[PDB]
Design a protein around this ligand. Structure first.
Ligand SMILES: Nc1ncnc2c1ncn2[C@@H]1O[C@H](COP(=O)(O)CP(=O)(O)OP(=O)(O)O)[C@@H](O)[C@H]1O
Ligand SMILES: Nc1nc2c(c(=O)[nH]1)N=C(CO)CN2
Ligand SMILES: [Cl-]
Ligand SMILES: [Mg+2]
Ligand SMILES: [Mg+2]
Length: 158
């Protein structure tokens, strides 16, 4: 199944963090990278006392179960020094969010797929569209069409 993973970093040299994350993603068992987006510099959503993010997206072919993929993505965040602040939407060395797990709908305590907020975020949708322009969501909406309706500002390259 193709998992679509959003990458963000706004601490400790984002470019190096995102490069490290891409290598580590390719090292996950039973999985391989299919496609990587460009790197974009995005203003923070949420608290404004934090740096701009590097945002990207990756398509990862995998035979892992979703929660097992999550165990691996969380492990890469911790390998890259991720610390969870008390505040919501605060800065991170590395954030790996599972946007889509093929066409699955998952609702568990650890995992909500499609990612709960991705449809509201140009920093998630634009890199996804770069790597998967024909994507259709589980609910039947086309990515291409969502971007139309919302008319989110285009992003700037890192
Ligand atoms: N699709 C998904 N991808 C990644 N983590 C998910 C997820 N759905 C639920 N989670 C859960 O989200 C929890 C908190 O992860 P965090 O990375 O701290 C949230 P965040 O990415 O900072 O905010 P965001 O989800 O609004 O982007 C995880 O422990 C994980 O169990
Ligand atoms: N621009 C931008 N803002 C964010 C980001 C992100 O990746 N990019 N992710 C967040 C929570 O994970 C909080 N805010
Ligand atoms: Cl959907
Ligand atoms: Mg996130
Ligand atoms: Mg996250």
């Amino acid at each position: 199944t193709v998992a679509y993973i959003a990458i963000g970093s706004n601490l400790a040299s984002p470019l190096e963090q995102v490069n490290a994350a891409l290598k580590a993603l390719g090292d996950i068992p039973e999985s391989h990278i299919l496609t990587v987006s460009s790197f974009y510099r995005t203003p923070p959503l949420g608290p404004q006392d934090q740096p701009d993010y590097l945002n990207a997206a990756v398509a990862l072919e995998t035979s892992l179960a979703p929660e097992e993929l999550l165990n691996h993505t969380q492990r890469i965040e911790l390998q890259q020094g991720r610390v969870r602040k008390a505040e919501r939407w605060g800065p991170r060395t590395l954030d790996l969010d599972i946007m889509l797990f093929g066409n699955e709908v998952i609702n568990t305590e650890r995992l909500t797929v499609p990612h709960y907020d991705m449809k509201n975020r140009g920093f998630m949708l634009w890199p996804l569209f770069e790597i998967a322009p024909e994507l259709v969501f589980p609910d039947g909406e086309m990515l291409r069409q969502i971007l139309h309706t919302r008319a989110f500002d285009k992003l700037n390259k890192w």
